[model samples]
Target: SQAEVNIGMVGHVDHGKTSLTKALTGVWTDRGISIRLGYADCEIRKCPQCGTYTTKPRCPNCLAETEFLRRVSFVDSPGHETLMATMLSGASLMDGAILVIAANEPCPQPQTKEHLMALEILGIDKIIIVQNKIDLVDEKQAEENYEQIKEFVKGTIAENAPIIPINIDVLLKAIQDFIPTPKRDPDATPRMYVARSFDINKPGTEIKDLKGGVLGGAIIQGVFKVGDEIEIRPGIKVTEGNKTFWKPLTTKIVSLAAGNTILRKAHPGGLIGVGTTLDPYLTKSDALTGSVVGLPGTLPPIREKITIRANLLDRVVGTKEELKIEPLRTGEVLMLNIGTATTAGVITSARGDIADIKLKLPICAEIGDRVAISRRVGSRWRLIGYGTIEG
Candidate 1:
């Protein structure tokens, strides 16, 4: 069908997210538009606040020289092994995922374990496992690493995922087949999850507004237009001091891009840029991480109980005491990170490896909401496994 497949690269940090990105897009994603802007074909998001639009080498808002967003966009989440919350923030938006594991390392690391669990909770069935660093391991050792992963997820969704032993040549070809470019959403709801928001000022420009910092992921069931106004939810309403004066600021779509090339529009299988109002009304903190912005009333807050299938990063290696998960026992205290919101909750019951959890923050969720479990592991937190939010 000539369809583009969009997927996410997920694994413990240092497992080679940037490396994979470098191999695919051939540039570092952490640098944002800097790499893309240097190229002649890179697209740039236009300023909704100002009347300027360009496929140039500058942000115009932050006045930062930048590049167009790459078609195979990635969140590049931190892999400190303690940043489970941050990982969830990025992983939740993925349609498909690549679990990168160092070939020298054995099974999934703690965070890798959690990301996989989260994918299952979210009902994301498509996955590919990258046994990276093959050059470090001999052929036999690489196979051993692959087997370790297979035995580890013997009962999980990734159980069937192929473990591609990687080197630049094999890795690149595997990427072409596994990681297709992501597309913009076609449904007309028009929603955006703001990962970055900033302002711009130019000489003699009187400090006008300019906001747009690389937000490329799923379209989440909607379409956007150049002048359409989107509401920022869980957004920080800006007021003039403490006088209680408030105004809701909306963003406009100024431009879109895919890789180094600029496209008029992108949908489902397309990664594009969104430009918006740089009005002082917005701040990086305004739309807290994970907060979604879209057509008013179309994206409402959701809260619900969930069902999860969790796997500890490691076997408790002891009796029930060792299996005790604090803040979320076999069926007790519950704390969950969904999308970008971390909420408090408790486990109510358990059966086999699955648990029924009740949350305190009460987020509205539908069938197949991705969920992962996290608990203290020897003074450090680790992602255990995942489950979906059902009825």
Candidate 2:
């Protein structure tokens, strides 16, 4: 199986992240909603009659829509500071990213810096900087802003990354040239990170007409085929007496989907959805998010506690102020992100840089998995540093 690239669109709010995604994927639906996870299965399409872009065969606005261009998954991340956790969760699935910067705005907007830091933390090295809104500024002004962009990234990881003028032609060219297809390991143990899960059936649907729960995420390694028996780690929480614990669930794969296409098997790289025979209530509203899916008994151990060898950054990210990061203190609560899982963790002990922390929820992770750490600073969670799981 060929590995698919997961490209993320990240930038400051109102910087056209969603617009660029729509432009690339051409997937606009009725009610003016874009695809979740920015996953578009089809090429961009344009309605000749309505003179609008969309992905529909029959336009929501008019009659017919014609296909325009290439297909790729764009992980849509929120630019709001409060939504940083959501963005971090999405980063686990990204193979590369297109960091959009408005030509009329100053370089290194708050969220722009934050998003870049996130990409760095996630170890996503391939980056394409999109200087968008070229049409909104004069040539001289655009040139000046372009210089600012170059200066802003001068000392950072993206310094060597390509800075392309944003336009449909150039954007497409940059993506094709810069974002290489990720490689897959089909022979490795199968594991999938659950990013989104849902109940497909609408309210009032007949019982017989209802479909099973769907799991949406990327296969980090190996392969999963239709009809394979799968186990979901840290699946559901059950309360018994005075103790509450999570129980892993077992289910058989009913179907598999890559974008809109049905597949008999799914491999690492691209985002895929798995249909399971579990009850709809089990998956509703992303209830199974942060869970791991794999062949029964093959998943990493589920843990409600973890210890990590900390590597705190010199300063906090996403802020203009240079605040020195302090050592983790006992009883200090921090947010942890590993793969697509996000959970609150309280420091129980700090010996040197090795901190033992207890998680609010269990995560299915291995000892070496990289975890991003965040602390409550002012009002929002600020990126402090990272750690490697210490067994």
Candidate 3:
């Protein structure tokens, strides 16, 4: 079958995403590439002609060589601080996830609970709990940690997920079972959630022809081919996989070797890139900044406010059964992170964990938009529980 799955990692900072990346792939996640032979500098590409602290590939020159590894790709999101909204976008990219928890530590940490709640709100039911730091704890203590997690996940969709005890050296092959295989629906039109984009402008290239940008992302469903007219954010573009003879927006799949190499035809459930003539604008253009484009009449356009339902996590720390059971006060504020868009809003209504957020901006969401809500902890923020947006 052509079906595949995307696996991502979620946990507090220092939970080992970078280490896990190196463990899975021998190369370090943020290692640099040498360029120009003698001019010693990190080879991480930022924009087309400059360098910034950016992820490898996705950059203009390196993307042509980007190799799409067959194994599951893990998105490293910030965990120490309450970056709830950013984590939500990362969760939305994966079909399943590996929830890493430090076994040596006590149960119910702030980041751990918040991420779990976000996953619930995102409707990611498939989870594999990696009870990390087992090397420090004795077998008995590890067992206790496992039991605590079992008791903790009860009444949630992750109740039945495996709480696998793992040591640091546990390789990617060992956890392959936890990676859920993504199921692709052939009926749906081809869609690529643009997470990375870049423009390719190098010396010797035609002066007027520097508007080439590559949209790199996972192909959630269907397949895209060269020459297919597809709509991005505000406009549509012609798909040309590679550049030839200094042609404008011409990216020859043969030249690049570092970004996500999704050539031929991007299929359902794997990484893909649609070589476009448009510049990098996935975040700046309001039309493209967090929007999903599809074939006419196939993709359902989302609106600002979406109605959904969410559940309270078993580990919710609050004493009140229904936090703000009545209604929100006039000056109250809440953070709503759905997909890649996170916004702070005032609560208009509250019923248990379910509440209505009069969002400051119209987030592109749908009927089943699962979401996570957070309240400010003393000097910090914590995820109280999970809920769905009920329209």
Which candidate leads the pack in lDDT?
A: 2
> In what order do the candidates fall by TM-score, top score first?
2, 3, 1
Sort the predicted structures by lDDT, highest score first.
2, 1, 3
Misplaced by over 4 Å in model 2 are: 1-3, 27-70, 80-91, 239-245, 313-324, 378-382
Candidate 2: the clashing residue pairs are none
Please list the Cα RMSD from the true structure of every candidate, rounded to 1 decimal place. Answer: 10.2, 5.6, 12.0
> Least accurate stretch of 10 residues (summed lDDT) in model 2?
29-38
List the candidate 1 regions with Cα displacement exceeding 4 Å: 1-6, 14-18, 29-70, 80-91, 167-169, 179-185, 200-205, 208-218, 237-248, 257-263, 266-272, 284-288, 301-323, 327-336, 342-391
Query: Per-residue lDDT tens digits of candidate 3, residues 1-391?
Result: 2225555567665655556556544445441000000000112223334322233456444444432223444544433323344444332456777787888876666567767776776677778887777888898888888888887789777887887776322333334445545666666666545544455455566757655466544454676666565654323333467632211122222222123443455564433445665554422323233444455434444444444454544443344543333333344576655544455677666655455667665554445655655556444454544455568
Q: What is the C-alpha lDDT of each candidate?
A: 0.53, 0.74, 0.51
Q: How many backbone clashes does candidate 1 have?
A: 29
Could you tell which candidate, 1 or 3, scores higher by lDDT? 1
Per-residue lDDT tens digits for candidate 1, residues 104-151, read 776667657766765665456667888788799787887788788888
| TM-score, predicted candidate 2 vs. hidden true structure | 0.82
